[PDB]
């Protein structure tokens, strides 16, 4: 779900999000999304909101009080206005009972506002529930047509599968860097690997249950992960009363990864080798 194209589509009269901040939509993954598109007058844009009342809210489109999602509205004068009148847009003006949240009504039965039955034929005290939205280019900003899309994000017991794009960044190697691969976070050096992964397998583990090989998602390559060098620092020194000179031994560390001498114990700095 790329919300970036939604943001940059066009200037929007309203981009109001209930229950979720607009910035966190990309980084949050929802189970399902529902896009509800319709066209209403500019005055009725505010009626598409939880806890609101009106003709559109009661009889056309109702949102729950605990609705999680966003409502986006934008002007569509060039598309939904004609000099003769665009009568192709209709709204429900009369209904027996208020619409439940996320409910639609397509019945065209004549509204019965009187004791006498309407008998299915329009007449006195009987009115058509559906009225035409006579949009015109010269109408005031309150009455100009507006396209409204409501995004409803729902989470269920099923695993979530809808969210924003995953950044690729770049690939670096031969350096102790912080790596994040498909939620596997750590630090290491991603050198070349002679191992051959099976297409299904993404990770690789040592005998002692630790990750040692990984597969790159962007390009199907195998990288050997080696932890960054670490060791113990030991200080070689005579008595302080004798002198104040010291030498430092990095245990088990190659001398090129830190009066320098290389020994089997580690790298020695500050001491001179003699025969």
């Amino acid at each position, epitope marked *: 779900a790329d919300y970036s194209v939604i943001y940059n589509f066009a200037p929007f009269f309203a981009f109001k999000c209930y229950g979720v901040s607009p910035t966190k939509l990309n980084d949050l993954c929802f189970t399902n999304v529902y896009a509800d598109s319709f066209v209403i007058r500019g005055n009725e844009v505010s009626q598409i909101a939880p806890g609101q009342t009106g003709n559109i809210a009661d009889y056309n489109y109702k949102l729950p009080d605990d609705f999680t999602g966003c409502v986006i509205a934008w002007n569509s004068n060039k598309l939904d206005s004609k000099p*003769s*009148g665009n*009568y*192709n847009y*209709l709204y429900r003006l009369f209904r027996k009972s208020k619409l439940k949240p996320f409910e639609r009504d*397509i*019945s*065209t*039965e*004549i509204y019965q506002a009187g004791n006498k039955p309407c008998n*299915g*034929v*329009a*007449g006195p005290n009987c009115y*058509s529930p*559906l009225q*035409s939205y*006579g949009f015109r280019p010269t109408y005031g900003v309150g009455h100009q047509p507006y396209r409204v899309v409501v995004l409803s994000f729902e989470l269920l017991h099923a695993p979530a599968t809808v969210c924003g794009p995953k950044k690729s960044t770049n690939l670096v190697k031969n350096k102790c860097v912080n790596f994040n691969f498909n939620g596997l976070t750590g630090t290491g050096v991603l050198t070349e690997s002679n191992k051959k992964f099976l297409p299904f397998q993404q990770f690789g583990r040592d005998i002692a249950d630790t990750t040692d090989a990984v597969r790159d998602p962007q390009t199907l390559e195998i990288l050997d992960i080696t932890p960054c060098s670490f060791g113990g620092v030991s200080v070689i020194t005579p008595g302080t009363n004798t002198s104040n000179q010291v030498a430092v031994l990095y245990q088990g560390v190659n001398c090129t990864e830190v009066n320098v001498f290389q020994t089997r114990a580690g790298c020695l700095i500050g001491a001179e080798y003699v025969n």
Partner: nanobody, 115 residues
């Protein structure tokens, strides 16, 4: 994509008869309701009559006898029978397919009467 075929219009003298026909090909999902609208010359658009999928008819003008709606379940088409034609019904007609999700519209038929 839905195509609503409109046919059966033209010039008819006063008191004549004709048969408008709308055939809905394309999506036209199962719980459909079919209707007819009227567009007088330079005026508003009112609803001629609507027929549902359970044969229930709702005429939106005191016009019973004038329009009669016939349903073809095998092809999911709707025919409007016009009789006793009088000059005040001279208007173009579009048929309205609500479907279930996205409603559609016709192309147009010229219905004219004068003497």
């Amino acid at each position: 994509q839905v195509q609503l075929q409109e046919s059966g219009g033209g010039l008819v003298q006063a008191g004549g008869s004709l048969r408008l026909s709308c055939a809905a090909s394309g999506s036209i999902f199962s719980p459909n309701t079919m209707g007819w609208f009227r567009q007088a010359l330079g005026k508003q658009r009112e609803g001629v009559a609507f027929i549902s999928s359970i044969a229930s008819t709702s005429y939106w003008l005191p016009v019973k006898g004038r329009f009669t709606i016939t349903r073809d379940n095998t092809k999911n088409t709707v025919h409007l029978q016009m009789n006793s034609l009088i000059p005040e019904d001279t208007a173009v007609y579009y048929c309205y397919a609500v479907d279930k999700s996205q409603d559609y519209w016709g192309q147009g038929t010229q219905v004219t009467v004068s003497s």
